[PDB]
Amino acid sequence: LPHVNVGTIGHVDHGKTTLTAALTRVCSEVFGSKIDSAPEEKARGITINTAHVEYNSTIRHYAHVDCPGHADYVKNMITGAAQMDGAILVCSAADGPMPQTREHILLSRQVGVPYIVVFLNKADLVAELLELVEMEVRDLLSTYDFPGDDTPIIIGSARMALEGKDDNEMGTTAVKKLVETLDSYIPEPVRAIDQPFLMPIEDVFSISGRGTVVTGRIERGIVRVQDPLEIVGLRDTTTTTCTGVEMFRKLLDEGRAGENCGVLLRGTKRDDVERGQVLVKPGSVKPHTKFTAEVYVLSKEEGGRHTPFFKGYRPQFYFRTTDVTGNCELPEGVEMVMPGDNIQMTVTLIKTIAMEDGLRFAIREGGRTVGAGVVAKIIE
Amino acid sequence: HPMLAAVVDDLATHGWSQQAHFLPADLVRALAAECRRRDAEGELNPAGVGRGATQEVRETIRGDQIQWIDPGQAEACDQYLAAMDQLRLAINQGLFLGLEDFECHFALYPPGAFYRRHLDRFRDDDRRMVSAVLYLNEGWQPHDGGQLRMFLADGVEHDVEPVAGCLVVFLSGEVPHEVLPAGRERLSLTGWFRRRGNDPF
Ligand SMILES: Nc1nc2c(ncn2[C@@H]2O[C@H](COP(=O)(O)OP(=O)(O)O)[C@@H](O)[C@H]2O)c(=O)[nH]1
Ligand SMILES: O=C(O)CNC(=O)C(=O)O
Ligand SMILES: [Mg+2]
Ligand SMILES: [Mn+2]
């Protein structure tokens, strides 16, 4: 049973929270289906108001994210607390597309959500607008570069399905149909360990007699002895070979995603590598400096700034394991930015950093986090 | 200095270490004094359990009273933090664990309070790697109870009396442990070193 991350997005009152309970029941009826004692932690940080449910189809296992408030959607989507492999946009025939519908489709594009599936809710209340409403939404999606013309759209009423109480084909059948669509349209996602090697570098040592070592926690993929590698970031890209992996004073033949270890390089001098760089499968990731980014500015209450900011904000951008200063470029008409607000900006970094579309980063003004962002489009 | 090499060796071979008199008695009394000074001002509060939205004070599991420590509150603590950071770096250089930072708080168990069997690492957040506890109690004795009890490999149990100066370090993801009731006040400085997660925030 593969693990697919999914979630509902759309306007308010349109029935996201309802299609959520509906999905659990239709699956539980038609598809099979303890407290943590650890000591509390110091901070807490952002407060994500997020609900989670689980439900299984025949083919796969789903983890589902629903959110109370629009603001909650914005925080959760930008941070990755709610990262979806495919999202279920809920729109109603009754009311049609509304502001938070546009904002969420857009927001999904920025944050890198791969695929979007639509469920036209409240079908019970209808006729003839279903043709017209599909037309609109399809172009609405296409406006933001999702396959709006070739996108699946299921029509039904979740409240029936939940009570289901299938009256037309619009009840239980349509939710079965939605699940069937997830099974089909959203491809099985690629596990971290099946991705190209990557490890952000923390410390750099030289153990007497065995060469130079860089440590960190492997983000994705696997590194094996005698694998070629590039060191990418803050400096001109360099090549090297892995000559060993160490962990708890034991010698391993390979390091794996999730593992904290030390990697031994061939030849590379201790001064030819530093914190912030990433150890990478060659040509897998490139150095970059200018990008567009969706950002959420933390509230006063969340440890963020007590006051807004303006053009020429040059804060610190934290990418994996190090800081780098960046210039911020806001859209036209935008003068101020309020703590707790979210906006798009074009950032230009003083140094080059290893990045890809969809990389999360933190923004810091003097050590403490004051914003959280995600890379939207690489420019230079 | 050589005492750090010991902890690093111990963690490597056994996954835990205890060292007597890890700090000098003079600094240990001042840490105990800072703990008391805080209690006297109502600055310690019931400690809770769990993370995020499900963090709750459940007094049938954990009953100590706490307050987190930061730099600049008291030189005794600044000294502690400095010792701990020397440890953090030793452990990084010798075991490559990738410890980035350190949470710690003063902890006071009133008599009768306890902490039932648990792992320090959260069920759904794996950032905690090394646990460290420093005790601050003078003239402790076996009749006072209040020992940390550790569940080691192969069914082996080990008790540690909470004696001034004593430091206990273990792998947070791997050594279940509990604190038994005591007949008198029990002061300590508990913390966790932790490694990178999946996000900065
Ligand atoms: N008649 C009907 N009402 C619905 C349907 N879906 C949602 N609603 C109504 O909208 C109310 C609140 O919707 P909710 O699921 O909380 O919307 P959300 O804010 O997007 O989560 C529900 O209790 C229903 O009264 C539906 O399919 N048919
Ligand atoms: O107080 C002790 O001896 C042990 N401390 C803990 O278990 C803790 O705070 O997580
Ligand atoms: Mg809702
Ligand atoms: Mn504990």
Give your account of this protein's structure.
The complex is a heterodimer of chains A (380) and B (201). Chain A is α+β, with helices and mostly antiparallel strands. Chain A is globular and about 75 Å long. Chain A is built from six helices and 24 strands. Chain A has three domains: 189 residues, Rossmann fold; 95 residues, Translation factors (Elongation Factor Tu (Ef-tu), domain 3, Beta Barrel), CATH 2.40.30; 93 residues, Translation factors (Elongation Factor Tu (Ef-tu), domain 3, Beta Barrel). In chain A, helix 1 packs across helix 6. In chain B, strands 1-9-6-11-4-3-2 form a seven-stranded antiparallel sheet, with helices on one face. Chain B has a four-stranded antiparallel sheet with strand order 5-10-7-8, with no helix packed on it. By secondary structure, chain B is an alpha+beta fold. Chain B has one domain: Jelly Rolls (Sandwich). Chain B is built from three helices and eleven strands; from the N terminus they run H-E-H-E-E-H-E-E-E-E-E-E-E-E. Chains A and B meet through strand 9, strand 15 and strand 23 of A and helix 3, strand 4, strand 5 and strand 11 of B. Bound molecules: guanosine-5'-diphosphate (GDP), N-oxalylglycine, magnesium ion and manganese (II) ion. The site of N-oxalylglycine has 10 residues of chain B, from strand 10 and strand 11. Chain A: One of its GO terms (molecular function) is guanosine tetraphosphate binding. Chain A: It catalyses: GTP + H2O = GDP + phosphate + H(+).
List strands and helices in order, with pairings.
The complex is a heterodimer of chains A (380) and B (201).
Chain A: E1 3-10, H1 16-30, E2 51-56, E3 61-66, H2 70-79, E4 86-92, H3 99-111, E5 115-121, H4 129-142, E6 153-155, H5 158-163, H6 172-185, E7 198-200, E8 204-207, E9 211-217, E10 222-224, E11 228-232, E12 238-247, E13 250-252, E14 254-256, E15 260-265, E16 278-280, E17 286-297, E18 309-310, E19 316-319, E20 322-329, E21 336-337, E22 342-355, E23 360-364, E24 369-378
Helix pairs in contact in A: 1-6, 2-3
Chain B: H1 2-14, E1 16-19, H2 25-39, E2 45-46, E3 65-68, H3 75-95, E4 99-109, E5 115-118, E6 128-135, E7 148-151, E8 157-160, E9 167-171, E10 177-179, E11 186-195
Antiparallel strand pairs in B: 1-9, 2-3, 3-4, 4-11, 5-10, 6-9, 6-11, 7-8, 7-10
Helix pairs in contact in B: 1-3
